[PDB]
Design an enzyme around this catalytic site. Sequence first.
Site, mmCIF file in Angstrom:
data_model
loop_
_atom_site.group_PDB
_atom_site.id
_atom_site.type_symbol
_atom_site.label_atom_id
_atom_site.label_comp_id
_atom_site.label_asym_id
_atom_site.label_seq_id
_atom_site.Cartn_x
_atom_site.Cartn_y
_atom_site.Cartn_z
ATOM 1 N N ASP A 35 0.837 -1.196 0.000
ATOM 2 C CA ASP A 35 0.000 0.000 0.000
ATOM 3 C C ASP A 35 0.875 1.250 0.000
ATOM 4 O OD1 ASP A 35 -1.925 1.873 0.323
ATOM 5 O OD2 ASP A 35 -2.428 1.335 2.393
ATOM 6 N N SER A 199 -0.775 15.719 -11.796
ATOM 7 C CA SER A 199 -1.023 15.393 -13.197
ATOM 8 C C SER A 199 -1.263 16.657 -13.996
ATOM 9 C CB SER A 199 -2.222 14.432 -13.293
ATOM 10 O OG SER A 199 -2.636 14.210 -14.565
HETATM 11 C C1 RBG Z 1 -8.991 -4.382 -0.079
HETATM 12 C C2 RBG Z 1 -10.188 -4.394 0.864
HETATM 13 C C3 RBG Z 1 -11.094 -5.568 0.518
HETATM 14 C C4 RBG Z 1 -10.964 -3.089 0.762
HETATM 15 N N1 RBG Z 1 -9.701 -4.518 2.258
HETATM 16 C C5 RBG Z 1 -9.717 -3.544 3.180
HETATM 17 O O1 RBG Z 1 -10.627 -3.383 3.994
HETATM 18 C C6 RBG Z 1 -8.507 -2.616 3.165
HETATM 19 C C7 RBG Z 1 -7.732 -2.667 1.857
HETATM 20 C C8 RBG Z 1 -6.579 -1.666 1.871
HETATM 21 C C9 RBG Z 1 -7.062 -0.256 2.171
HETATM 22 C C10 RBG Z 1 -7.882 -0.216 3.438
HETATM 23 N N2 RBG Z 1 -8.990 -1.218 3.379
#
Ligand code: RBG
Length: 330
Positions: A35, A199
């Site tokens: 991330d 951008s």
């Molecule tokens: C990727 C999903 C399914 C939304 N899982 C989550 O609850 C996480 C993903 C990364 C960002 C924060 N939310």
Amino acid sequence: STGSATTTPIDSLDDAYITPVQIGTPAQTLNLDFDTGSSDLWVFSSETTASEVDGQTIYTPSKSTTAKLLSGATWSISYGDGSSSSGDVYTDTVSVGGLTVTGQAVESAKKVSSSFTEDSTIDGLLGLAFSTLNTVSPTQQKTFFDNAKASLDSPVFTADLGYHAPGTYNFGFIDTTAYTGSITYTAVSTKQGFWEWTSTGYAVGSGTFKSTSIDGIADTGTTLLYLPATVVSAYWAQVSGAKSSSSVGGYVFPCSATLPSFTFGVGSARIVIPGDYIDFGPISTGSSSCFGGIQSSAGIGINIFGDVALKAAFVVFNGATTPTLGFASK
Ligand SMILES: CC(C)(C)NC(=O)[C@H]1CCCCN1
Ligand code: NA
């Protein structure tokens, strides 16, 4: 040193991508969501409330000969989608794609929100934004990238996400076989702790390019492309029957539609997102309304170049003294 790991969609929509990560000694392999919009490496663990674990692989620090409690340290994070997690902290050896960091802070979840529990395919997150966003208290911790940086051949990592296919995260080198043409680099502001850039504009389908500055972040942990309401309205106006639905929570379109491409500017260069990348399929199983992959940022406070945009490019996250982003077509 370098590392190279394959990243794989969690489902048929590319909702997120998982990358195997080795933690501990002997290695415990967990599949983490890399991330670039956050800065915590956190995992489902032997400490996670049992009713909040549903199929995830867990990290068990007591089985790692190299795990050390980081005494007194806690963490707690809230994401843009309303999800959250919190817990305590260990240091341990973490390897990605053959690149090893010793003494990495591994944030062990005691609690996770429902959206994490419900996703059996994601065992935690590996943050790649700037370490100023790390939530560990009272001593903030470094990301895996920041800890690896001095050892790397070049202080970079690259994201090469696939459309309905695996892709690659590389650390410490730029694979010149992985893209076409040249890489266009653009300035980054670290003031909010993100890979924030501007951008130079956009086009919808075969339309004229609109020169306009759009600040936003390069965020591999966000599925969709979130842009200003003006830009998003201009895109969906080109799709017969598309509309913004407050019931569904964004733009929807008829599943019978063919979507136009979307182009975004990187300096004088252009990245084209094919229309198919903007299809996120039926809003509910069997529906003929489909969810759009370009959505308004107006209720967020920042524009987000998420996976919809990033997967159309080879993306260089240059962590030199003056950070920059690079984009190439592929
Ligand atoms: C990727 C999903 C399914 C939304 N899982 C989550 O609850 C996480 C993903 C990364 C960002 C924060 N939310
Ligand atoms: Na959704």
